[PDB]
Amino acid sequence: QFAKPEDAVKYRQSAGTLMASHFGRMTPVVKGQAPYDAAQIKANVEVLKTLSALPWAAFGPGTEGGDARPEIWSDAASFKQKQQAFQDNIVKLSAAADAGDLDKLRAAFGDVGASCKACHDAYRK
Amino acid sequence: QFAKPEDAVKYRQSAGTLMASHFGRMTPVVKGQAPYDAAQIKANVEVLKTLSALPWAAFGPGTEGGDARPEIWSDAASFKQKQQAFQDNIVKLSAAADAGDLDKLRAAFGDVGASCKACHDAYRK
Numbered sequence: 001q002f003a004k005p006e007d008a009v010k011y012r013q014s015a016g017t018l019m020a021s022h023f024g025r026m027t028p029v030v031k032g033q034a035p036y037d038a039a040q041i042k043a044n045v046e047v048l049k050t051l052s053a054l055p056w057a058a059f060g061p062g063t064e065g066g067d068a069r070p071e072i073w074s075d076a077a078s079f080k081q082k083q084q085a086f087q088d089n090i091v092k093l094s095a096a097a098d099a100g101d102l103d104k105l106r107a108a109f110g111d112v113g114a115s116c117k118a119c120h121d122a123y124r125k
Numbered sequence: 126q127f128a129k130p131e132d133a134v135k136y137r138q139s140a141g142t143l144m145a146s147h148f149g150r151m152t153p154v155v156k157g158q159a160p161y162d163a164a165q166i167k168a169n170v171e172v173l174k175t176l177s178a179l180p181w182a183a184f185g186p187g188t189e190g191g192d193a194r195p196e197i198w199s200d201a202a203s204f205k206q207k208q209q210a211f212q213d214n215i216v217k218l219s220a221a222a223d224a225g226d227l228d229k230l231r232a233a234f235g236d237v238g239a240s241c242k243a244c245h246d247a248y249r250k
């Protein structure tokens with residue numbers, strides 16, 4: 001859906017921006033510094049679920065650029081393993097939120113966050 | 126969820142970027158220049174549905190900036206009318222996609238597009 005590689009870069013960076021907001025806004029809840037309203041967090045994680053699937057299709061043919069490392073395209077299976085496992089971790093976060101289980105949310109949140117970081121450490125300049 | 130007004134601006138502009146991609150990538154389908162696969166478009170409009178609800182909460186207290194016109198905050202009800210009617214138009218687009226009805230999709234797409242433009246013309250610098 002991108003007329004130029006620059007358009008893919010703009011897309012995936014905006015997806016990243018929105019994920020960071022929907023993920024990071026829960027830090028105070030996970031830490032107990034903000035109250036836990038199970039319904040609020042269930043809805044937010046649903047947003048995060050939708051966004052979490054979006055970046056990967058914007059690293060398609062010829063879309064090199066931004067702060068993507070070139071290792072993304074030449075090691076297609078290792079990068080894929082990492083996005084698929086990130087979204088696994090997102091399913092687990094969905095399950096905790098949908099259950100209204102804060103303990104479970106805290107653990108699942110940390111796993112998601114570790115997955116984000118692991119991919120950036122390998123694949124983001 | 127924004128530590129500074131700049132963070133709200135970054136959020137709403139990235140929401141706008143992703144909406145433009147999920148909306149605009151259907152132009153060739155609506156025009157018949159790309160094939161119509163009802164399942165593909167149903168899924169895409171579901172993404173667009175989720176994104177379409179996101180910008181409005183990022184025009185909150187003290188979040189003035191970017192290319193938002195100041196008229197957004199002082200006329201809170203007229204701006205609200207416009208986002209609520211845009212999302213009405215999104216419901217109609219969802220209905221057409223969910224029905225797998227291309228004629229209906231074409232009409233609903235044009236209505237959405239008109240709603241985008243109407244709000245930008247009034248409220249975007």
Ligand code: HEC
Pocket residue numbers: 009012013014016017019020021023065066067068069079082083086112113115116117119120123124
């Ligand atoms: C690989 C499987 C990734 C996972 C998992 C996550 N991110 Fe990511 N991110 C990735 C890359 C390769 C890039 C660079 C894209 C480019 O072309 O520049 C990014 C970028 C971001 C950004 C910065 C966007 C910007 O302002 O330019 C953010 C804020 C970001 N990523 C956030 C983020 C979060 C919160 C994630 C887990 C919930 C996450 N990413 C996962 C690769 C990958």
Ligand code: HEC
Pocket residue numbers: 134137138139141142144145146148190191192193194204207208211237238240241242244245248249
């Ligand atoms: C008011 C009810 C709006 C509707 C409906 C839509 N948009 Fe919007 N848009 C609006 C404002 C006030 C702004 C400026 C925000 C800022 O602080 O700068 C925007 C911005 C955009 C952008 C540009 C983002 C950027 O690169 O800075 C885009 C691409 C955009 N809007 C797209 C878009 C589309 C495709 C819409 C309908 C599907 C749509 N907007 C609706 C206000 C409103």
